[PDB]
Symmetry: D2
Subunit: 179 residues, 4 copies
């Protein structure tokens, strides 16, 4: 089977139209049914976005089906994505907050700073002793040590690095990027 | 041409991927260019959205190109959308769009002629999410709205007067005089 | 003596997983919690690690009457504006409300024109939309690469202005004095 | 005497197209504008039609040092939680900062289990993610159509919780006491 068409939730499209004081009838020739409005591919949708002066993104907001189960989502140790770089392991991830990236890390250690990022970040040390380095004010390098149970908050776009303090003793941290 | 095909900005996709600590290579089955990544149709994209655990919408957030020219956009009288509004078989308003822009879709600026008055039945709306400010450019305007404890309230606005309306407060503007047709400007936003 | 809405303070406390009892040195009543002035409140803001501002968000009493507020022509603030000794505008407030301090709605008479020197502003954080109610308006603004641009707006025409774009409205004709509405917001 | 940052006040004034001069009876210096206590400030808030909160937004001083803040085990607030008359949790604050009051990071010991009665909370505005650092955790929550649901989380498992979803974490094994990390935010 094959579909030539793009589907958009009708209720949603109508609601967008009403923000511009319009109704379906003010669109072109579009077929609709009881739940869906159909387009001849992306380019057709873009034109309609231009006409309504609304970013394309808006036409899908809400239209992906929640990955939750009864208001909640659960992940398991090793159940998701996992990779060597650090050893990164995804914790629970959800389409109900794409801005949220929760990680577990093993540190393999010893300088390789990142470039900072748009997310705020909080890190908690679950095991061992962690060397943290970051670029402070006036681009001066700073450092400190975090022990099991200690935590740190990091402002957006502050460059940073976590390594083992001891060397050989391999530590574990949790990192939550969000907002 | 290929109407099925879906394009997604590469830089954006890459950035999304790096939020999940991935790269394009982890999507084995996609063509890309220098600027674009392409998908075989919607179903392909949905699968990828699942895999990355991100709503389909995310792939386009930010990607729309500004309709401004040098930080500004200009509209002309009658240059845009325009329409009559009839509520219960009562001709109520003529809506005219003022400037509209994709840089603030939440902004709806209107010019209105009023056609109804006290001889017609009342046709409130159901309020709306937007805040609203209205200015009277011409004539004398009857404004009615549902206040506290669902009690109906009313007042009259004259040329140069103005009113702010909290979200979801139901309201109606009509001519005070009846026959004398008034004009207002309405700005919905936020 | 400082009063803070109890429901609000409690709600803030619960964000830090606390309750009133964890502030040992405060009297409360059914609706209000009381402090020994600002300095006492600042210490508590420190303790909760919350900006002082938060303790008042929502607490100013609405200036609306039944979900609405009304202003009258000439009823509010009004003022002349003179830039470099050039009479440029007459600003008149339209309705203003503490339920959206970010909203500044104005009516303006234009006094300047092309015979006067140009007096741009520095742009501003607010988005702005302008509608011409009367006459013909010369609009100038700094575009991309800091290049000056210009156009003319007639009765009924409108314009949207991105934040921090510097701009100026003047009469196109000179002597013929125009009127516009300007809405700054968000 | 109340102090308000001059630059901030000026900026607020310019949103209403005003300047300091338009304030009846205020002293200023180079950095500060001064009021005769809160009531004076409230009147000015009325005059400008701006909530009182606005006069402090931004004005709390950052608790960060070089873009970062660090907390230590037991270094901050800590407390027992008793619901009905069942010892349920030991809350410990992790790093907290006035640069994101919406962020509440916690470490918890669990004391209750299936022999105790169930003590759900009422959900909350924050999103929440929880990670199990130690033991085995019984998690119960109110799902769709108000139906109670349950599952078990083991060391290293995690869970996301939508706003205002009511929930409870207890020990799966009575007596074996588990530990979790909870991050409320946004
Ligand atoms: C002037 C009114 O607010 C227009 P409506 O919101 O009823 O579409
Ligand atoms: C309508 C104009 O934008 C007024 P200004 O911003 O120059 O105060
Ligand atoms: Fe990181
Ligand atoms: Fe309206
Ligand atoms: Fe302006
Ligand atoms: Fe909770």
């Amino acid at each position: 089977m094959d579909v030539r068409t793009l589907a958009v939730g009708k209720a949603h499209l109508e609601a967008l139209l009403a923000t511009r004081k319009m109704t379906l009838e003010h669109l072109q020739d579009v077929r609709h049914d009881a739940t869906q409005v159909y387009f001849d591919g992306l380019e057709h949708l873009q034109n309609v976005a231009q006409y309504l002066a609304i970013p394309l993104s808006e036409f899908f907001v809400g239209q992906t089906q929640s990955d939750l189960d009864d208001g909640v989502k659960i992940a398991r140790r090793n159940g998701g994505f996992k990779r060597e770089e650090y050893t990164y392991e995804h914790l629970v991830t959800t389409n109900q907050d794409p801005g949220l990236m929760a990680l577990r890390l093993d540190l393999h250690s010893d300088l390789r700073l990142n470039g900072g990022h748009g997310s705020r970040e909080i890190v908690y040390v679950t095991r061992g002793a962690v060397r943290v380095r970051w670029v402070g004010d006036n681009d001066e390098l700073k450092e400190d040590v975090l022990n099991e149970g200690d935590s740190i908050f990091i402002l957006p776009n502050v460059p940073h690095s976590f390594t083992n303090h001891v060397g050989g003793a391999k530590s574990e941290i949790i990192a939550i990027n969000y907002g």
